[model samples]
Target: GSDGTREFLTFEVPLNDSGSAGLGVSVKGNRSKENHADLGIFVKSIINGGAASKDGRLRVNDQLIAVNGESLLGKANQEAMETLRRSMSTEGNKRGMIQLIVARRISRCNE
Candidate 1:
C-alpha cells in the first residue's frame, strides 16, 4: 500500500430536468479482485459545466463512496448507475438534492 493521507468528501448536486443528478461526472469501478479499493467508484472524468466541476473539490482520483447517504460498496456498474438514477428520479426527495460521498488518498507537497 502507498503511504499517503486518506480523506472523505461529500457534495450535493441538483437533479436535472432530463433526469440523473446532472453530475456530468463519469465514474469507473475498481472493486475488482486484482485491484479493489474501498467503495471503488473512481471519478473517471468531470464534464464541463457539470455539478462536479462547479463543486470544485471533486478530483479524478477520488472514489465515489456513496450516493444519497447509501454506500454502494463493491457494487457493479449497473447497480451503481441505478442508484444514481433512482436517487435523482421521482423515487427520491421532492425536486431534491443528490449527494455524492467520496474518498481519496493523497500527501502534501511543498515547493
Candidate 2:
C-alpha cells in the first residue's frame, strides 16, 4: 500500500525587507504512527506566486529537513516551528538569507 515515490530537494530563500520569506506554505510534522522513520515536518500546501513557489522549488508533500544549517529531523513540531519562526523573525531575517532542505514526494508510476 505504498506508492514508493520520494525525492529530496534543497533551496535557499532570501528574506524580504519586511523580514518575510514570502514563502506561502503551511508546514506540519509527519505524524504517521505507521512509520517511525518518517519523522520530519512536511508541507501541507503551497500558495501560488509566493516566495517558495516563485523560487520555483518546493511543492506539496515535501518534508522539511533543516533550516539555517540546523537539522529538524526527529524534532518535535513545536521545536521546528520555533526554529522556523526565529529564522523568519525580523531580527533573524537581517541575516538576509535562509536555507531549506526539503524532501519532495513524487509519483513513481509515471517515471
Candidate 3:
C-alpha cells in the first residue's frame, strides 16, 4: 500500500484535558441511562477557571444537549469534540473565544 492518500485525523477532547493557558475540557459528567431523564452533559471542574467558570454559565451535573445552537443528543462524543476542536483551531478568526450554548438544569434551593 504505497498510495499517497490524505487521511483526516480525528481526536476526542478529554473532560480533564489541559491547555497551555492552563487547562481545557472544564467540565465532567456522563449521559443519562434513565429514559425519563433529559440528555445532556455536566460541568465538573473549572481548570484555569475560564469564562464558562467565571460567568457561572455552566455547573456540575448539568446536561448539555446543545452548543452554539446545535443538538448533541444522538451525536457521538468524538464527533462533537472534533467539531469543537475545528472551531477552536480556526486561524485568525478569533482567539480563545469559544462560546458554548449548552442546556442545563439548576436546583432552585442552591442559591
Candidate 4:
C-alpha cells in the first residue's frame, strides 16, 4: 500500500516535472507498528494548461477511478490519462461521460 506522500514523491512529482498536469493525495500514517497504512482521496490542484483542466471537476489529486462505471484501479497512470482524454473528445469522436471512483481507507489514530 503506497501512502500519499510516498506516492507523491515517487510518482506525482516527476510527472509534474514537464510543468504539465499534476495529481496526488494526502494521508496520515498509523502510529502503532502493528498497523500504519491508510488511504485518503483528494483533489489537490488543477493546472491551467492540461486537458483535464478544461473540465471543472478535475483537480490535482482528485480521486479518479471510473469513467461511466469503468474501474481505473490497476491501470498505469498513462492509461488513466488516456481514458480521460478520450472523454473530452467531441461526440461521434467521443467515448462517454467521465466518472471517477476512488477507494480510500480511513486513518485510525491508534493501531
Q: Model 3, poorest ten-residue lDDT window?
A: 6-15
Give lDDT tens digits, candidate 2, residues 1-111: 656766656776665422233566677776658764446677777766455666645766677887767677767777888877776453336656566788756564221
User: What tens-digit string does per-residue lDDT give for candidate 1 at 1-111?
Assistant: 767866777777665422333667777765556654444567777776666567544777577777877777667766877776676454335547567788766765310
Of 2 and 3, the candidate ranking higher by lDDT: 2
Q: Which segments of candidate 1 are over 4 A away from where they belong?
A: 1-5, 16-21, 31-39, 90-95, 107-111
Please give the clash total of every predicted structure, in order. 0, 0, 4, 4
| Rank ordering of all candidates by lDDT, starting from the highest | 2, 1, 3, 4
lDDT of 1 at 23: 65
Off by over 4 Å in 2: 1-7, 17-22, 34-38, 90-92, 105-111
TM-score of 4: 0.35
Error of 4 at 78 (Å): 0.9
| lDDT for model 1 | 0.64
Candidate 4 ranges with C-alpha deviation above 4 Å: 1-42, 46-62, 88-97, 108-111
Top model number, lDDT: 2
Q: Which parts of model 3 are misplaced by more than 4 Å?
A: 1-25, 28-40, 68-73, 91-96, 106-111
Model 4: per-residue Cα lDDT over 7-93, one tens digit each = 111111222222243222221212233544222323445555543344333334434554435544445555655654553232212
What is the model-wide C-alpha lDDT for candidate 3?
0.42
- Among these predictions, the greatest TM-score belongs to 2
